[PDB]
Amino acid sequence: SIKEQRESLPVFQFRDQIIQAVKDNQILIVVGETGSGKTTQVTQYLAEAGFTKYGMIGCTQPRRVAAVSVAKRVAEEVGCQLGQEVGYTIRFEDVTSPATKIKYMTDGMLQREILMDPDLKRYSVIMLDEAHERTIATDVLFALLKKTVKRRPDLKVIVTSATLDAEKFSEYFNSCPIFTIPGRTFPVEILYSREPEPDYLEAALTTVMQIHLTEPPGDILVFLTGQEEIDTACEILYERMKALGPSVPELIILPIYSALPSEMQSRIFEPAPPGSRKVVIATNIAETSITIDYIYYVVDPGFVKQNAYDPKLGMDSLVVTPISQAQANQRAGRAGRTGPGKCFRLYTEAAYQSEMLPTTIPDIQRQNLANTILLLKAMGINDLLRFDFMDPPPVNTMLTALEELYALGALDDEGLLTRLGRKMADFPMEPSLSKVLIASVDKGCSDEMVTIVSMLNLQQIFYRPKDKQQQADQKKAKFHDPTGDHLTLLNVYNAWKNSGYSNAWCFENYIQARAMRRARDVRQQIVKIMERHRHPIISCGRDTDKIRQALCAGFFRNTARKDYKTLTEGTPVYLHPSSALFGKQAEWVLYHELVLTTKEYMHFTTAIEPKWLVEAAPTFFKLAPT
RNA sequence: UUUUUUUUU
Numbered sequence: 001s002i003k004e005q006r007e008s009l010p011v012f013q014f015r016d017q018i019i020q021a022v023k024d025n026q027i028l029i030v031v032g033e034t035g036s037g038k039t040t041q042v043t044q045y046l047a048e049a050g051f052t053k054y055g056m057i058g059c060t061q062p063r064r065v066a067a068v069s070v071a072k073r074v075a076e077e078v079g080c081q082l083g084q085e086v087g088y089t090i091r092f093e094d095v096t097s098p099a100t101k102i103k104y105m106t107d108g109m110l111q112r113e114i115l116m117d118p119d120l121k122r123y124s125v126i127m128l129d130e131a132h133e134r135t136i137a138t139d140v141l142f143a144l145l146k147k148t149v150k151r152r153p154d155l156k157v158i159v160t161s162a163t164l165d166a167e168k169f170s171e172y173f174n175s176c177p178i179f180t181i182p183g184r185t186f187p188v189e190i191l192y193s194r195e196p197e198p199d200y201l202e203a204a205l206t207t208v209m210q211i212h213l214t215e216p217p218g219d220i221l222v223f224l225t226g227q228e229e230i231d232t233a234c235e236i237l238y239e240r241m242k243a244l245g246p247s248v249p250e251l252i253i254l255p256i257y258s259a260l261p262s263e264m265q266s267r268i269f270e271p272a273p274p275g276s277r278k279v280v281i282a283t284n285i286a287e288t289s290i291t292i293d294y295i296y297y298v299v300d301p302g303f304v305k306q307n308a309y310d311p312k313l314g315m316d317s318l319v320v321t322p323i324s325q326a327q328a329n330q331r332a333g334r335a336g337r338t339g340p341g342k343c344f345r346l347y348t349e350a351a352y353q354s355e356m357l358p359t360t361i362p363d364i365q366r367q368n369l370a371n372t373i374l375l376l377k378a379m380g381i382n383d384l385l386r387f388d389f390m391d392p393p394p395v396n397t398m399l400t401a402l403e404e405l406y407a408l409g410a411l412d413d414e415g416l417l418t419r420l421g422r423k424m425a426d427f428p429m430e431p432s433l434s435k436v437l438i439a440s441v442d443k444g445c446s447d448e449m450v451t452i453v454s455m456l457n458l459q460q461i462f463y464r465p466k467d468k469q470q471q472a473d474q475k476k477a478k479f480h481d482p483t484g485d486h487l488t489l490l491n492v493y494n495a496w497k498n499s500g501y502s503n504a505w506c507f508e509n510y511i512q513a514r515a516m517r518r519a520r521d522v523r524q525q526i527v528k529i530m531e532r533h534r535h536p537i538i539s540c541g542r543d544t545d546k547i548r549q550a551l552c553a554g555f556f557r558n559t560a561r562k563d564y565k566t567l568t569e570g571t572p573v574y575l576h577p578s579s580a581l582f583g584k585q586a587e588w589v590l591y592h593e594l595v596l597t598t599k600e601y602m603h604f605t606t607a608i609e610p611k612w613l614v615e616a617a618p619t620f621f622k623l624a625p626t
Numbered sequence: 627u628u629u630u631u632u633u634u635u
Contacts, residue, residue: 062633062634063633063634064633064634090634090635091634091635106634106635107634107635108633108634108635109634109635111634111635112635133633135633135634136633136634137634137635225631226630226631227629227630227631228629228630257631258631258632258633259630283631283632284631284632285631285632287632288632289632289633304631304632305630305631305632306631306632307630307631307632316630318630318631320631363633371635375635427635428634428635429635459630459632459633460630464629525635564627574627574628575627575628576627576628576629576630577627577628577629578628578629579629582627582628583627595630597629597630598628598629599627599628599629601629601630603630
């Protein structure tokens with residue numbers, strides 16, 4: 001029964017050996033294959049081996065869903081109630097009790113816990129799971145746990161790794177042993193394209209057609225790059241199927257991407273009807289976050305939309321670029337979850353061998369780092385450039401982050417953390433947003449600022465479906481403030497609140513309920529943090545300008561003037577068509593982010609008055625006679 | 627001027 005499942009897993013074969021390996025070495029690298037089941041077993045093995053006696057067993061996961069899934073299964077396998085001996089902790093949800101002995105958590109959570117307790121006294125063993133994904137939190141934890149083990153001999157650390165990176169991990173973690181566990185995974189025949197494919201979208205559509213018409217049963221999973229590309233692919237495929245007479249077997253074409261509402265996301269999981277073949281046209285969300293059952297075919301175009309930060313210009317760049325080998329292999333493996341399968345790679349073998357990096361560049365080496373830098377300074381680490389990162393971030397990215405924190409008053413001239421800086425690090429957001437919150441206290445608009453900040457944290461607020469695009473834009477424009485997007489975000493939350501937090505209201509007005517529910521969770525958390533720091537939450541009422549004054553305290557660098565050209569570097573930047581300021585004239589502008597997609601676009605742009613810049617940032621804005 | 631992959635406190 002329950003025991004039978006634990007024994008079937010291969011990891012049971014090395015159960016005694018794992019426990020001894022953990023006893024023998026303080027830091028152990030574990031290479032776990034897909035079918036190993038190390039996530040739900042190693043945790044227990046140590047708990048049954050008596051490791052639970054003086055500390056807790058913590059295991060990180062890079063995803064919230066993964067943390068709750070595995071905690072549910074390990075609770076069921078241990079036969080206790082979730083929250084008792086086996087619990088989980090993620091943001092807004094601490095499902096643990098004084099009886100908790102095994103604790104699954106998000107890496108983020110443990111990172112934030114190490115700040116208040118750098119020795120992590122409550123834990124006897126820490127396991128870093130799915131570390132091959134190389135989130136910023138995981139990378140930070142590598143360094144911090146390495147330092148912590150020297151202080152704490154009793155602490156035991158386990159770091160899961162990919163096969164290629166296992167040796168690299170070992171040398172970094174004091175040349176400690178590597179434990180490899182075999183995993184049961186069904187074979188996937190990988191077919192490369194004979195010649196390079198000029199158009200990856202067309203090739204993917206052609207390949208879907210081929211498979212459906214000429215291959216044995218089984219649903220297809222296609223990896224594309226964005227929402228517009230996927231919706232265009234769905235429309236095109238449907239029309240090609242119709243072109244053929246109704247004699248040809250039904251092809252159910254379903255998109256999947258995070259912006260897609262949870263109902264429509266749910267329709268992908270549903271089993272296909274009799275004598276029908278499903279194709280799921282997906283982003284990289286299907287690679288790890290979404291696991292779809294009964295996929296036997298994968299079409300691999302070979303591209304992903306990748307974020308890369310340019311600190312010189314203070315701008316993210318989203319570029320469709322070739323995936324990595326690791327990423328390509330992950331994709332292939334999705335055909336092999338339910339049973340044996342095939343993967344059609346639309347690139348030549350040479351291109352896998354020579355045009356694709358063996359590993360995706362880690363997040364820490366291509367994102368803004370202000371948030372990370374502030375946290376590390378808060379923990380009292382100072383020469384961050386020399387800090388023991390496994391893969392060190394670009395030097396310019398670290399210097400700009402440091403300059404940013406200096407400019408906001410988080411750091412003094414000597415580089416050390418200020419009282420403001422310490423306060424700001426207790427808030428979970430980029431430092432520029434925490435600056436604005438604390439500035440809003442003095443400016444008497446804290447109540448509005450909190451909700452606004454909360455909205456900024458969220459992703460995909462306004463739903464814009466393909467067929468009903470115009471209708472969405474109309475409903476969105478009812479909320480537009482004359483000043484632009486920040487106050488528009490305020491309106492959306494207030495109107496949601498005033499409708500009694502209705503999911504119906506959201507659907508009607510083409511607004512993602514998932515986003516609004518998260519905003520309320522974020523808001524409640526922020527309000528608690530404000531109270532702890534004795535910062536009062538004050539409403540500005542009608543005087544909304546006070547919000548705009550507060551925004552300049554944090555976002556003075558992100559400012560532009562119409563011809564728009566950036567105030568600092570003079571670089572041209574453009575209002576995004578979604579903006580409430582789009583068709584409108586406004587001479588002086590403030591924006592939340594500068595992202596380069598097909599054009600350099602300001603995101604969440606708001607109109608400002610230059611007075612507010614010299615008021616809020618006196619040192620950085622000089623007043624001169626013309 | 628015409629619309630952003632994934633994910634974390």
